[PDB]
């Protein structure tokens, strides 16, 4: 609760400290990529990923510096329809790949 | 059929075992796992499979198959960052001090830094200064208590220290004790251009003749060609 | 040369004498080039080892791998002896990682030096055809974190110190200077925030109360740290009391065109009518009344030079032999760049503010500013190399 409560409130120097605590060490590793990010919006939609608050993770992404960051979180999440509609708007040089993985998720699915 | 995140997460941990990273994608995916899935992309820009299952691993919790890996691949760079990201910070430093030497100097900074945030100023001052970063770290720690900085300065007897308190002093405006450190760390440009400054122009001259410095000497110049 | 025990027995006694070039004379005569080259190596010859390793080229890592390690137990000669090695790729790593490592623990004054010795490696490595574009790429890429980097370290010194050294109008500039020149990727430890708040503080101590006002609202899209929350609040509330215009003796004037720009230019460091670059000096980065030329085509950079010393009694500035003749070599600087780039031109257009250049880094300065720094430090502040290198 505490841990999930540095993460609303961006405290990610805290956030750090409570997790290394957990022993979370994946976490701990992931947090110290993002600790030099100050841009609010971008912060905020890793830290609401962390979360696994997704559409306010690509909200929050759509409005920060890098919006293909939500493209990329779509994708690694494998919500290939959702990743399709950002690659449209924000990289369409990406569609014939995002869809290659697609197509080989499908042809496994059938 | 299963939908059961549970399923998904135990056959991660059997793709670490594995060391099928395409499945292990897969899996982070259904799972929900998406920082998981983010480290595994940022891996590939490493060309050893067993550290990116090290990376795997490290995002399942399996910090012993981690450690396991991580010695196997001989990245004692990475070992060290994980024992770090893993609170082992004694562990840390004997790896740093015997394969990754030159990551021993930040090791050291990062744990004065863990040590400063645990309110243990005593054990972080001595790390800052095996870090060689005390000439900075130091004088922001202890911003907040004047007292043990100046025995701190005074104790170190170091001429940038002696030059950062001079410089300290002087601007809460008591030059007389700004002298005194200025004389300490030699520092005769600065003893010259404060006298300067209190208008006592022929004992800048007295300094500037005795101890030959350029720098000085310079200052005294422009100070008399602006007169 | 049929009496082995007694050659042998007279060859390592010569060794044990310290007598190497004999012992080699004998062990040479008995055709050992094996324990020739131990001998040079143990006896530390190692300017004979080298003539050797150059000899017979099988030699070259048994020379310099142990001379590499020794200097770097003893990072810059190992960096040396990687270059020495011809493993450049490798240097470049070893000097990125300890890059990283000085940026990580906040000495951005190692890094700026770090990243313009990486750039001067580039350009070393761009002498090949075959790496040119990709490695010139590289060159300006690190050539500008250098100088982001010794920027950053007087605003980071001045946030973390509770007094400063630097001038309220050098922040100011420094300040400016890293918003233009700053990407949409930040690099690496270096703070908008503390730039943005730092900027801020110094615009409200100068009369810039819009520019501050904007920097306060630029502050409010970012995440800001608690340690300086407070701050930020109080001169947010403080700045609206203040008049809405900017002091018009902060205003950058072109001097090519006369045209005053804006406090923040949204195109970087160019001038917003002739999209002439702004050059700054490395110690207080005002604007410097410079002005980049270039040579018309057929006149070589050798014959440049003789027409600017023989003194008789965007669109790029293109200079004839005649005007080149009629300039005071007072009035012309010049950047002499390692070979696959041209040599650069400078005009001063105010012959009475003496300007100053490094002859290694090439950086320009206030004259009265670098010869102050320089006899301060004992060398060029940029470069850390003593007045008694006038090379590249």
Same mark, same amino acid.
């Given at each position: 609760?505490?841990?999930?409560?540095?993460?609303?409130?961006?405290?990610?120097?805290?956030?750090?400290?409570?997790?290394?605590?957990?022993?979370?060490?994946?976490?701990?590793? =992931?947090?110290?990529?993002?600790?030099?990010?100050?841009?609010?919006?971008?912060?905020?939609?890793?830290?609401?990923?962390?979360?696994?608050?997704?559409?306010?993770?690509?909200?929050?992404?759509?409005?920060? =510096?890098?919006?293909?960051?939500?493209?990329?979180?779509?994708?690694?999440?494998?919500?290939?329809?959702?990743?399709?509609?950002?690659?449209?708007?924000?990289?369409?040089?990406?569609?014939?790949?995002?869809?290659?993985?697609?197509?080989?998720?499908?042809?496994?699915?059938? | 059929?299963?939908?059961?995140?549970?399923?998904?997460?135990?056959?991660?941990?059997?793709?670490?075992?594995?060391?099928?990273?395409?499945?292990?994608?897969?899996?982070?995916?259904?799972?929900?796992?998406?920082?998981?899935?983010?480290?595994?992309?940022?891996?590939?820009?490493?060309?050893?499979?067993?550290?990116?299952?090290?990376?795997?691993?490290?995002?399942?919790?399996?910090?012993?198959? @981690?450690?396991?890996?991580?010695?196997?691949?001989?990245?004692?760079?990475?070992?060290?960052?994980?024992?770090? @990201?893993?609170?082992?910070?004694?562990?840390?430093?004997?790896?740093?001090?015997?394969?990754?030497?030159?990551?021993?100097?930040?090791?050291?900074?990062?744990?004065?830094?863990?040590?400063? @945030?645990? @309110?243990?100023?005593?054990?972080?001052?001595?790390?800052?200064?095996?870090?060689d970063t005390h000439r900075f770290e130091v004088p922001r720690?202890?911003?907040?208590?004047?007292?043990?900085?100046?025995?701190?300065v005074?104790?170190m007897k170091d001429k940038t220290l002696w030059r950062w308190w001079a410089q300290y002093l002087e601007s809460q405006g008591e030059m007389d004790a700004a002298l005194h450190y200025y004389e300490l760390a030699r520092d005769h440009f600065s003893l010259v251009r404060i006298h300067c400054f209190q208008g006592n122009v022929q004992k800048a001259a007295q300094i500037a003749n005795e101890t030959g410095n350029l720098a000085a000497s310079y200052h005294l110049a422009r100070q008399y060609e602006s007169q | 040369?049929?009496?082995?025990?007694?050659?042998?027995?007279?060859?390592?006694?010569?060794?044990?004498?310290?007598?190497?070039?004999?012992?080699?004379?004998?062990?040479?005569?008995?055709?050992?080039?094996?324990?020739?080259?131990?001998?040079?190596?143990?006896?530390?010859?190692?300017?004979?080892?080298?003539?050797?390793?150059?000899?017979?080229?099988?030699?070259?890592?048994?020379?310099? $791998?142990?001379?590499?390690?020794?200097?770097?137990?003893?990072?810059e000669?190992?960096?040396?002896?990687?270059?020495?090695?011809?493993?450049?790729?490798?240097?470049?790593?070893?000097?990125?990682?300890?890059?990283?490592?000085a940026?990580?623990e906040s000495r951005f004054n190692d890094a700026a030096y770090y990243y313009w010795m990486?750039?001067?490696?580039?350009?070393?490595?761009?002498?090949?055809?075959?790496?040119?574009?990709? $490695?010139?790429?590289?060159?300006?890429?690190?050539?500008?974190?250098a100088e982001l980097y010794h920027g950053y370290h007087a605003i980071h010194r001045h946030t973390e110190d509770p007094f400063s050294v630097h001038r309220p109008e050098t922040l100011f500039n420094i300040s400016?200077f890293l918003?233009?020149?700053?990407?949409?990727?930040?690099?690496?430890?270096?703070?908008?925030?503390?730039?943005?708040?730092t900027?801020?503080?110094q615009?409200?101590?100068?009369?810039?109360?819009?520019?501050?006002?904007?920097?306060?609202?630029?502050?409010?899209?970012?995440?800001?740290?608690?340690?300086?929350?407070?701050?930020?609040?109080?001169?947010?509330?403080?700045?609206?009391?203040?008049?809405?215009?900017?002091?018009?003796?902060?205003?950058?004037?072109?001097?090519?065109?006369?045209?005053?720009?804006?406090?923040?230019?949204?195109?970087?460091?160019?001038?917003?009518?002739?999209?002439?670059?702004?050059i700054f000096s490395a110690s207080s980065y005002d604007v410097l009344?410079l002005?980049?030329?270039?040579?018309?085509?057929?006149?070589?950079?050798?014959?440049?030079?003789?027409?600017?010393?023989?003194?008789?009694?965007?669109?790029?500035?293109?200079?004839?032999?005649?005007?080149?003749?009629?300039?005071?070599?007072?009035?012309?600087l010049?950047?002499?760049?390692?070979?696959?780039?041209?040599?650069?031109?400078?005009?001063?257009?105010?012959?009475?503010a003496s300007i100053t250049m490094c002859p290694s880094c090439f950086q320009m300065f206030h004259s009265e500013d670098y010869e102050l720094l320089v006899l301060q430090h004992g060398c060029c502040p940029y470069c850390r190399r003593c007045k008694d290198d006038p090379g590249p």
């Amino acid at each position: 609760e505490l841990a999930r409560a540095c993460l609303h409130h961006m405290e990610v120097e805290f956030a750090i400290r409570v997790y290394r605590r957990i022993g979370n060490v994946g976490i701990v590793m =992931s947090l110290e990529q993002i600790k030099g990010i100050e841009d609010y919006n971008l912060l905020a939609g890793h830290l609401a990923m962390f979360t696994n608050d997704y559409n306010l993770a690509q909200d929050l992404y759509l409005a920060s =510096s890098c919006p293909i960051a939500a493209l990329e979180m779509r994708r690694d999440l494998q919500h290939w329809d959702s990743a399709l509609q950002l690659a449209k708007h924000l990289a369409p040089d990406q569609i014939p790949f995002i869809s290659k993985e697609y197509a080989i998720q499908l042809e496994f699915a059938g | 059929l299963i939908k059961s995140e549970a399923v998904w997460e135990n056959m991660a941990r059997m793709c670490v075992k594995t060391q099928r990273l395409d499945v292990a994608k897969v899996c982070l995916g259904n799972m929900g796992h998406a920082r998981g899935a983010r480290a595994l992309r940022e891996a590939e820009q490493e060309p050893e499979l067993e550290a990116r299952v090290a990376v795997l691993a490290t995002q399942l919790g399996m910090l012993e198959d @981690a450690e396991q890996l991580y010695r196997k691949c001989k990245r004692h760079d990475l070992l060290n960052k994980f024992y770090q @990201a893993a609170g082992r910070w004694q562990e840390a430093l004997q790896v740093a001090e015997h394969h990754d030497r030159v990551h021993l100097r930040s090791t050291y900074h990062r744990y004065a830094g863990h040590l400063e @945030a645990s @309110a243990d100023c005593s054990r972080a001052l001595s790390y800052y200064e095996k870090s060689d970063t005390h000439r900075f770290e130091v004088p922001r720690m202890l911003s907040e208590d004047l007292p043990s900085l100046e025995l701190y300065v005074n104790k170190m007897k170091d001429k940038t220290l002696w030059r950062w308190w001079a410089q300290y002093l002087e601007s809460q405006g008591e030059m007389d004790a700004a002298l005194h450190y200025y004389e300490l760390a030699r520092d005769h440009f600065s003893l010259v251009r404060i006298h300067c400054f209190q208008g006592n122009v022929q004992k800048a001259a007295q300094i500037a003749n005795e101890t030959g410095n350029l720098a000085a000497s310079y200052h005294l110049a422009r100070q008399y060609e602006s007169q | 040369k049929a009496e082995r025990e007694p050659l042998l027995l007279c060859a390592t006694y010569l060794k044990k004498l310290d007598s190497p070039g004999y012992a080699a004379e004998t062990y040479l005569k008995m055709g050992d080039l094996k324990s020739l080259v131990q001998l040079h190596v143990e006896t530390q010859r190692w300017d004979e080892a080298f003539a050797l390793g150059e000899k017979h080229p099988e030699f070259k890592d048994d020379i310099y $791998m142990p001379y590499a390690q020794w200097l770097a137990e003893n990072f810059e000669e190992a960096q040396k002896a990687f270059h020495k090695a011809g493993r450049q790729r490798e240097a470049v790593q070893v000097l990125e990682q300890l890059t990283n490592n000085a940026v990580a623990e906040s000495r951005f004054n190692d890094a700026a030096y770090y990243y313009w010795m990486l750039s001067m490696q580039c350009l070393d490595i761009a002498q090949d055809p075959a790496q040119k574009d990709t $490695m010139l790429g590289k060159f300006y890429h690190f050539q500008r974190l250098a100088e982001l980097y010794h920027g950053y370290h007087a605003i980071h010194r001045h946030t973390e110190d509770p007094f400063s050294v630097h001038r309220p109008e050098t922040l100011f500039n420094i300040s400016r200077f890293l918003l233009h020149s700053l990407p949409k990727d930040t690099p690496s430890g270096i703070s908008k925030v503390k730039i943005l708040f730092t900027l801020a503080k110094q615009s409200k101590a100068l009369g810039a109360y819009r520019l501050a006002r904007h920097a306060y609202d630029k502050l409010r899209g970012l995440y800001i740290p608690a340690r300086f929350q407070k701050s930020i609040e109080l001169g947010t509330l403080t700045i609206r009391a203040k008049p809405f215009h900017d002091s018009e003796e902060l205003v950058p004037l072109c001097y090519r065109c006369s045209t005053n720009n804006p406090l923040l230019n949204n195109l970087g460091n160019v001038c917003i009518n002739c999209r002439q670059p702004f050059i700054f000096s490395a110690s207080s980065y005002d604007v410097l009344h410079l002005v980049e030329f270039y040579l018309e085509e057929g006149i070589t950079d050798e014959e440049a030079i003789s027409l600017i010393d023989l003194e008789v009694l965007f669109v790029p500035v293109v200079v004839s032999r005649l005007v080149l003749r009629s300039m005071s070599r007072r009035d012309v600087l010049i950047k002499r760049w390692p070979p696959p780039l041209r040599w650069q031109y400078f005009r001063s257009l105010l012959p009475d503010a003496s300007i100053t250049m490094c002859p290694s880094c090439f950086q320009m300065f206030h004259s009265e500013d670098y010869e102050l720094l320089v006899l301060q430090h004992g060398c060029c502040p940029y470069c850390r190399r003593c007045k008694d290198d006038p090379g590249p």
